Write an enzyme that holds these catalytic residues in place. Sequence first.
Site, mmCIF file in Angstrom:
data_model
loop_
_atom_site.group_PDB
_atom_site.id
_atom_site.type_symbol
_atom_site.label_atom_id
_atom_site.label_comp_id
_atom_site.label_asym_id
_atom_site.label_seq_id
_atom_site.Cartn_x
_atom_site.Cartn_y
_atom_site.Cartn_z
ATOM 1 N N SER A 274 0.840 -1.189 0.000
ATOM 2 C CA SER A 274 0.000 0.000 0.000
ATOM 3 C C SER A 274 0.877 1.241 0.000
ATOM 4 O O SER A 274 1.972 1.249 0.571
ATOM 5 C CB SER A 274 -0.946 0.031 1.207
ATOM 6 O OG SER A 274 -1.671 1.249 1.266
ATOM 7 N N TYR B 192 -1.893 -0.211 10.252
ATOM 8 C CA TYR B 192 -2.049 -0.657 8.869
ATOM 9 C C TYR B 192 -0.847 -0.248 8.030
ATOM 10 O O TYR B 192 -0.281 -1.064 7.292
ATOM 11 C CB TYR B 192 -3.342 -0.096 8.271
ATOM 12 C CG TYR B 192 -3.506 -0.393 6.793
ATOM 13 C CD1 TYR B 192 -3.151 0.545 5.832
ATOM 14 C CD2 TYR B 192 -4.005 -1.615 6.360
ATOM 15 C CE1 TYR B 192 -3.291 0.276 4.482
ATOM 16 C CE2 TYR B 192 -4.152 -1.891 5.010
ATOM 17 C CZ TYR B 192 -3.792 -0.941 4.077
ATOM 18 O OH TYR B 192 -3.933 -1.205 2.732
#
Lengths: 249, 250
Positions: free
Chosen positions: A139, A152
Amino acid sequence: TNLPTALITGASSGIGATYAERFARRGHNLVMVARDKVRMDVLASRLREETKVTIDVIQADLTQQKDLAEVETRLREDTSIGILINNAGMGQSGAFVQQNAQSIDRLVMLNTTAPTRLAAAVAARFAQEGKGSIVNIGSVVGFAPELGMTIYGATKAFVLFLSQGLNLELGPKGIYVQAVLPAATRTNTLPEVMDVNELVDAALIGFDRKELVTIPPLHVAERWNELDQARQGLMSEIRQAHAAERYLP
Amino acid sequence: TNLPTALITGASSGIGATYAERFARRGHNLVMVARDKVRMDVLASRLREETKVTIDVIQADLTQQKDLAEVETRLREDTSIGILINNAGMGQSGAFVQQNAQSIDRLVMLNTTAPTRLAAAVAARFAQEGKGSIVNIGSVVGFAPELGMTIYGATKAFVLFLSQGLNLELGPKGIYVQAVLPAATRTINTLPEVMDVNELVDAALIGFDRKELVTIPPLHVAERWNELDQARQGLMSEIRQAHAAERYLP
């Protein structure tokens, strides 16, 4: 026409579902892995009818030891699997102080422990065969602690480093390790966000070009090179015998 | 006058043991956490005699849910603890293809899951108090996939990001989050290129007292860190999320 079977985690929706459809139309047999078995069976049934490839469906919650061990065993023993799409992952909901011991366990387990273990399951067989592909879905958040998704983002920084380490370890063995780093992806009174089809199409263009780090939403590709250079630039100035003089009284 | 108690994981040897000795000499009460209770008790007994501070010793395997929950409870409920040294960690033995499902679980659990959960246990109380310090022990290996310790380096890349994320989140609440990134640290036919653990922790505590956010003692050119962080944000500044870049367009 000897296309390798592709095992894809998180195959019930989003990026994983798009990868499944893409590889099935290319002619690859599939092994679909996800927690939502119903949506997998619906998608797999349609892809069997359209593309006539064989698709195995494995219901698995990769936060569970039993499910993770079952997928590892499939990856180790199924010599037809030559592609692993490490796609299973979850986001962080809320600030750090709102997180739970359960939530932290699951977030690290699904985004960090599970993809590492699945890569390890295939790497031994891939190295003996001299070929294989591992695609880790990272990501852009792995570059952005400013976004406030601390855990995250931390798991995604893990994923990128894992991809870089595996390329240097397994690349010489004939193994292709790709890191695909999406930004906001579509997986009302507002317009924004990139379509998941455009994201996977961009990721597969890098895949076919054997690109090591693929960041579709990055407008200036040189920025990645400069980041990697800055990383190595820091390492080139590491002197391990003593601390730098700025830490001396 | 009222120096806060410091809880230190991996306190039985190496960096953790040295942090204990340093904070005890400064006058801090200690809570030592490690799996080796015998070595910990030897160390704690010595520090009680030298510094006259109080030391609680908690035997705990931070890869276990029961032990980790006990340390979480101690961090949440013990209002005297104002410093957390997230030091517990282990290295990687062998190449990636030599790793085990058991070994991977423990490596991620100890270096990533446990420090994140321990930080969360203190952050809730720290935020209510408006003060507190979290020291995460990372590693220079987090910058070097070339070193061949892929999983270990990945956990240390995790720890650095965690520190950066916590500073921006908890800094505004009055919480100090420091990342300490050692290289080779010593915890005859070769040239020394390992730093004494006393020199490493002394450098780390100088950064601690200066409220340094990222402390890399073996980094000779401090500007290299600034340039890396600038390049990181420089990459983020060119992120355009609506469509893929033209190099991925036919």
